[model samples]
Target: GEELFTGVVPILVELDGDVNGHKFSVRGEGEGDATNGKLTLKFICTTGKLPVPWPTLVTTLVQCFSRYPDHMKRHDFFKSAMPEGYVQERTISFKDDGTYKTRAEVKFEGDTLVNRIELKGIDFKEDGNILGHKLEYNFNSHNVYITADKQKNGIKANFKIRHNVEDGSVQLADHYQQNTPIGDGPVLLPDNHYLSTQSVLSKDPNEKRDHMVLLEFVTAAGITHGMDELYK
Candidate 1:
């Protein structure tokens, strides 16, 4: 008989700054459930500035949930091992001007959550624009699948999420939005791919929104257990 690798583990969180560097202090625990060659992790990012447009934040956070090296390309197994046995059951809406406007549900099997990814807004200049994207993962089981559905697309619709995980701390770097092909995808938005990558920065109080742009990852049971393995 096959077995599910579900376990509870402890983890440590650390922080790093520009110039000054490493600051290790925070701590947390991980709760994970892995079975039948599948792994799912749910961890919370306490410190640092999360990305904007929620789905990218989700994607950024999910990358840290996996057991792969820090920087892997599309050819890596980590990308391939993304949730399987799911169907792309969502619809993409378009405007009469041949530009993208909205998206529908994208599901992952076995998990009850019908993760809906939508393009909130977009701006393009034959180059690219700062777009808004969001993801709402409605959980059915007691577990939330953070690393599920790797192939699922259209969250950002234009930008690709860039992330880094150090110890227990997760950082949502800048986003790449350009009219270029990322792994065989279509022309991306934002001509400056490097400029697109964002980092955690404190927002000025004088800004329009009192609160800064944030990406939140919450699970019914809190952070996942697999995070311990990563921290260890």
Candidate 2:
């Protein structure tokens, strides 16, 4: 969809869409001195009763400014001091009231470029409960994994966030169950767990963490169901 922005001299970049009846808004706001690149940004998503998929929200937020007209890109709100070929000293804090499940939240700060990017430092402390276990994620500069089967530092987790610092990408996987040993034993069903994945990548230098909206999404379980095309 070719975004039609009617707000001339506007300060925020935004989008609104509905998926399977769930409505949400993606809003981008700029902060600080845009000329010298001494600024930060915010990407907020507001959701209504029926929520949007978190994976889709990430894509919308990252590409909010990707399609802006060149002139609009020159505006202070879109300007960044980032060098001609890199995204640096950037951080993103994300949160979503899980589709009526876990209130998922994550924060990541890192130095990145189109090819060479890495998570230098971070803080992602949140717990979620889905199915038959309580989940907590463990992350580093390269990837993240969560174990919700009631064990510490176990060999497996049902959820994973594999960061592709290479493309500033997040190759993620979330299955309904992990074969890892569970103290309680057994679950809803061996194959009942949905195994799905989404590949998220971006080169944008502006991103933030405060969001109340659920940018809606249709979950097509199985396979590498990604919207990477948006970045291209």
Candidate 3:
């Protein structure tokens, strides 16, 4: 039988600040199954005035996602790989409030990582209902895809992440489409959105061998209060 833990779980670290008017924050929360229940992390940024390249800005954020798990884990939460399937799973559940609950599932199969999340008793203003969300990443291809369901509104959007192998940079793009009717036929309207940002690991001359840079990106549309858990 598996163990179930509960209560106010502690986050390994939470960082928040305004970098050149780009307000940003990152936090990790939760505590049991890394596949169904262990830890969740979130990165958020408010739209800013300064113009930065999206790829660069996204690369920095991706690096944080790539590196922070080990930094937060401190040698725990991960189950040793199994020889039978050679896959690992971790899960966690949280009591966000008395009424609402948050849960996450993460799977590691070779170089790919898949995460799925569900929030109960929470409302998503955009879709006018609660829904499930998913995020997937392929380390070998350096690609990431995120999807949020807005079935009630007949809208679907996807976020993509790619890396520049030569320069060690990352890029992000988003595509959104809406189901609509046109000329006696059903059509999907395109909302060709674009993002441009640049993220670099600049050397912190004042600090010893420090090369961390602040990453920022405008929040995507259709995001609800509880959707952040999926990205974690």
Candidate 4:
């Protein structure tokens, strides 16, 4: 497949007929400080086990980025950042079957980053229904900035997902779902009520509460950058 710009630029791609033939191509030019780009994906299947929908996969990816620090520590993605009283946790429940039911919450105050996330499984309680137990996850990620550069970049973040289980699965499955992104707009804070809802949640007793509000602002910036390059 191919996507063409006015005429000066065109992105293209090719895929073989196979189980993992998905592919993409992206190309664009800089229009002064502003830039342009494009992406294309190709794939084919005989209809066996379906993988997770693109939207869900995208949300999961964003959530992972928002929560990188915590997982990084356990997985040791980088040198341990000393130690502090920072607190974070993940909870899960499991069904008789191999599937899971789960929820997770994270909070922190640190030198490099700070953020929080809360996620839980959804449940439906009604009459004469036997859909068994289903899993619907939520992700609430909050992040803070430390260095002056990061402060300028604002705070980085991701979200969380919870099911009632022991070992949560990260593999993508064939499923459909909806997700919404959160954060401030082109500018941080608000002069009205609706925008005020995106304000950061803080548990600190210090006078720097305004600094905490930068998390959402930073997140909004990262999202804009991603949107400008996702296909690329």
lDDT per residue as tens, model 4, 175-213: 122211122212121111100001222323553311111
User: lDDT tens string, model 1, 152-220?
Assistant: 431122322322222332223223221111243321121111111112323345544322232222212
Error of 2 at 107 (Å): 28
Compare the candidates by TM-score and give the number of the best one. Answer: 2
**Model 2: ten consecutive residues of lowest lDDT:** 100-109
lDDT of 2 by residue, 1-232 (tens): 1122221112343555443334555555543221221223444654432133333233223211222232233211111212121121222332321221111111112221111222211222223221211322222222112222334211122443332223344434332212222133232111112222233223234534434322211111222223354455
lDDT for position 7 in model 2: 18
Candidate whose lDDT is highest: 2
Per-residue CA lDDT of candidate 3, range 66-98, in tens?
Answer: 211222222111121111111111111111211
Ranking under lDDT, best-scoring first?
A: 2, 3, 1, 4
How many backbone clashes does every candidate have? 18, 7, 24, 21
- Each candidate: what lDDT? 0.24, 0.27, 0.25, 0.21
Candidate 2 segments whose C-alpha is farther than 4 A from its true place: 1-11, 32-39, 46-50, 53-55, 62-232
The TM-score obtained by model 4 is 0.18
Minimal lDDT window, size 10, model 4:
189-198
Q: Number of clashing pairs, model 1?
A: 18
Candidate 4 CA-lDDT value: 0.21
